[PDB]
Design a protein around this nucleic acid. Structure first.
Lengths: 110, 94, 71, 67
RNA sequence: GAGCCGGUAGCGGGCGUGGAUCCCUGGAUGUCCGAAUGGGGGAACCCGGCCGGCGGGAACGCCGGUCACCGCGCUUUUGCGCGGGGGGAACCUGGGGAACUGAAACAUCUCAGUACCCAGAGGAGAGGAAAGAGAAAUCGACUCCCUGAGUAGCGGCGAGCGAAAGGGGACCAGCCUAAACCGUCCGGCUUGUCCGGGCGGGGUCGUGGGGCCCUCGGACACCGAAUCCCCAGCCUAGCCGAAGCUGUUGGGAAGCAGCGCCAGAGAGGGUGAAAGCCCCGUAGGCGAAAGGUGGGGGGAUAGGUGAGGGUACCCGAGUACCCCGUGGUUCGUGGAGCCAUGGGGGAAUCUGGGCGGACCACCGCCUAAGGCUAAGUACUCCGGGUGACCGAUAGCGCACCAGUACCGUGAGGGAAAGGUGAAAAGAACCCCGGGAGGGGAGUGAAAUAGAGCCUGAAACCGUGGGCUUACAAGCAGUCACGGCC
RNA sequence: GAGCUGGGGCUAGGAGUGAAAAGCUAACCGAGCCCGGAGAUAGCUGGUUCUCCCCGAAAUGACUUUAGGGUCAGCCUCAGG
RNA sequence: GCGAAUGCCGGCAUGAGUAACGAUAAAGAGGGUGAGAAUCCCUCUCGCCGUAAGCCCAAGGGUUCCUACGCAAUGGUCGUCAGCGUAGGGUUAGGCGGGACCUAAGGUGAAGCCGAAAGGCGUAGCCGAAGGGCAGCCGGUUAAUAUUCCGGCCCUUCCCGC
RNA sequence: GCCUCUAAGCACAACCUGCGGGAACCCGUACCGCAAACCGACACAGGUGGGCGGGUGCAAGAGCACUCAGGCGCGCGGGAG
């Protein structure tokens, strides 16, 4: 929870909470990890204006806080990422690995 | 440095009518020598700068929640046409 | 400073005062003058070569002038 | 606009000079804009400024080393 | 490593895995004042002289390079080319330098050479290689600690103030210059042979330098930055990185239950209530760069040190020494010495000359009246770490738009105010109303958690219920009793 | 008129001025005001906190620039004997 | 580990709903606007100034001035009024003034005399005044300001030429 | 400012003078402003520099009384008394 995160717009589950059912890590902040899961909000029964529709009420309510999130998962759900072993030239490749493995890999999926 | 760029149009109502009649008012770098003014004016808008007056006004009075401020400083000055030219866009538009 | 010496300072301090004798001749001290003071010399002149001055300080003077006198 | 960085490197005295000049005029124009387009404008402001800035940093650099 | 346009959302707009925000190092102009210096000037502003440019050229007007003052060295020629200066919480050196209060007064005495004003050096200055110590026949630079005695001792001997050698510990280089002797020299005056100015040999260290004779002599010693090259050390960014899920009461869960896990890392914070395996890039260890600081270890660069007896002497500073006026010293006046100077006197070459017993006769001690820095104690602006150190009236006054509000002429003075909630989900819409603010509905675990909105007690003010009260003088109360409820 | 008065300046707090009572000197200067030596001195008064248990004081001697203060003495309390 | 120090900081009562509303220069009516107007707006009665409560320049103030909204705060109450709050817009001059010029007292200060240091003193030159000196005035136009804008009239100095 | 000579240039392009043509920047204004905007900690009846201070009346006149312009009716009201 600092200038150094966990999973990014990537995807995973919730341990202690209200859903567990893992999904879309919509986006996450650099300091307060502050991240959205598209799972568990409200409506804000908003405005009286047209800002929110001529008949105003916030729509998608979801800004996810707790870090109990059940971060990433290869052919292995509840996990904790590794680092790399490179093998390649200028091979940061801090893939996501241990038990099963998930790297993100700029192809087929984030 | 050495970049002639020095102004902000006089978007002021009153001043509008003058623009209309044959001269126009603006705001500019709080310092433009009056001659610096005829030059900016001339080379700038390809005009024939005839007479320029200079006025300044600071922004006294703007409250800010727990603390307060006033505003920075606004420099106003006016320059007349010569025939009734230039400032086209500006004026015609409004 | 605009009043030292030229050939080596002398513009200086001094704490003084007194009492009364008798001492090893019938008595002890006699003391009561916590006072402070000054302390100095003089001033004179001669010539570089057809135009000059001197300034300086008494003694060290006599020596000196003799000296630069040698040239 | 590392690109800009490129043509940058590229020009030199007179060029850079009159070029950045004109440009700055351009931005000036934007300034008069402070009241019309706006919305999309944002950028012209931040960046255009930046670009011109570069122009400067540049002549500085080049004739800098020059003398 | 993949989000970011600070603190700010919000509007209205964006750039970026063809290393975006951003962490450090070098940059680049760098508004005007400010030691300010081109001139003036109540700073943060108005003047102008020189060369460059752009404008309708010139008189106007900007960007521009420009133009104090001081001492300092050089070409003194007309002078072009170096340096300073201005700051800085506390420590440093010197410069000048005070009453209280004590001595139950108070004049010597005392706080003290402290407070305090100034100049100035630093990153530490200071001192720093013995006219030293001390008395045995030794010591051996200077600085800082403990011991030295609170004795030796200092004094209306009263209040008090109060050593030093040694010893123990740390930190251990010792080097230089005029010293005219000499030579050569450049200038001399005047000529020959003095003095002045260079480079030298000597360029003293525990005293010899040198000039004369001979004995000489032909590779280790490195700088108090001598100096230069790297392991550069940090600066700020790194990196990995030990092992649990199931269940369960629960708004919760890490708890309570079942088993399964780690540990050269059960230090901590953090995740909706008390997690070694959920959060931390830590203690576990490892991490590193082309920039900015060297004690190292090493080299090379090493200026410059590094013999023997003889002989007529020339050779470290104008002042020691002596008298009086005074400072320092544990001494206040004294039988009072040494060092330190202000006055008048005013010299010696090491058979010299001060220093130990005022002073005399002795032995002894040292070699001064030039210069050089190291290293061991000080300090705290600033970084980091720790606290039988504090909880928001103690803590820095100062926990965050307080050195600012505000009072004062200036000097100067100098507060208050922290904690809504797990997270904004923080209040649609309907109902009285000018609003506010009040009633509902939804949030929600609570909202008598609701925007100063945690916990929110005492004072005092309210609305309701029991008892109570109009022949009565009592701080209070309170012992008894009866009537109420 | 030794008048009154605006603007400009020069002198200051042991010193200023002072047609002088001790006058005035940023609103009560017989010696300015802020900061500092300072937390001065303060035999003078104020104040000098939980409970309980024992005992139980002297409100005089003596000299003191002391005399509504102290030093030594009488009375007290705790421990040994 | 505390009544207690006319103590310290911060609440809180008490007089007390009496004292008091800032000048004895007076009001009163009608319509009006408004949620509400003794206390705002227009209008009709009446008193007080008038050499001043009137005009003006300058000083010192520095927002404010206007136009639109607004009052919960602030006016010693009221209040839909304001210098209040919010937003916007508002002042410009070759000949007004100040400097682009002059010196006074007086301050500074190349030099000079000066001190234990920090300074003292100080010619010259400089800085320093609604004091010296210097080229216009009147009539018109905005919510607003003007011998500054417009216009009509009279100039001013320096530059190039001739 | 008028003159008035050095330097010295002028005097061949210096100064007085006509006309034409070209120029001429900085800061300043608004409103209060004998006062609820300036000074008294307040919309404090205190103070504060020059400019005519309209008219009628009185011997005289910035005193007087009514007033001209212009400016107010003092910022809490009503009620007996």
């Amino acid at each position: 929870m600092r200038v150094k995160m966990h999973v990014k717009k990537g995807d995973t589950v919730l341990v202690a909470s209200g859903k567990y059912k893992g999904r879309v890590g919509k986006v996450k902040e650099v300091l307060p990890k502050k991240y959205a899961v598209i799972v568990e909000g409200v409506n804000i029964v908003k405005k009286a204006v047209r800002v929110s529709p001529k008949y105003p009420q916030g729509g998608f309510i979801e800004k996810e806080a707790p870090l109990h999130a059940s971060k990433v998962r290869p052919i292995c759900p509840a996990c904790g990422k590794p680092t790399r072993v490179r093998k390649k030239f200028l091979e940061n490749g801090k893939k996501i690995r241990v038990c099963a493995k998930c790297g993100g890999a700029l192809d087929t999926e984030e | 440095t050495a970049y002639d760029v020095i102004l902000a149009p006089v978007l002021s109502e009153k001043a509008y009518a003058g623009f209309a009649e044959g001269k126009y008012t603006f705001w500019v770098h709080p310092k433009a020598t009056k001659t610096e003014i005829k030059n900016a004016v001339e080379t700038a808008f390809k005009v024939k700068v005839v007479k320029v007056n200079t006025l300044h006004v600071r922004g006294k009075k703007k409250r800010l929640g727990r603390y307060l401020g006033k505003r920075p400083d606004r420099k106003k000055a006016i320059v007349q046409v010569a025939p009734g030219q230039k400032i086209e866009a500006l004026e015609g538009l409004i | 400073m605009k009043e030292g010496i030229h050939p080596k300072l002398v513009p200086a301090r001094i704490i003084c005062g007194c009492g009364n004798v008798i001492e090893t001749y019938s008595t002890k001290p006699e003391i009561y003058v916590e006072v402070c003071s000054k302390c100095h010399p003089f001033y004179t002149g001669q010539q570089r070569f057809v135009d000059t001055e001197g300034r300086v300080e008494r003694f060290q003077r006599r020596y000196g002038d003799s000296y630069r006198k040698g040239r | 606009m590392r690109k800009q960085l490129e043509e940058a490197r590229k020009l030199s005295p007179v060029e850079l000079e009159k070029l950045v000049r004109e440009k700055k005029r351009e931005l000036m124009e934007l300034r008069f804009q402070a009241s019309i387009g706006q919305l999309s404008q944002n950028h012209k402001i931040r960046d255009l400024k930046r670009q011109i800035a570069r122009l400067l940093t540049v002549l500085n650099e080049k004739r800098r080393q020059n003398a």
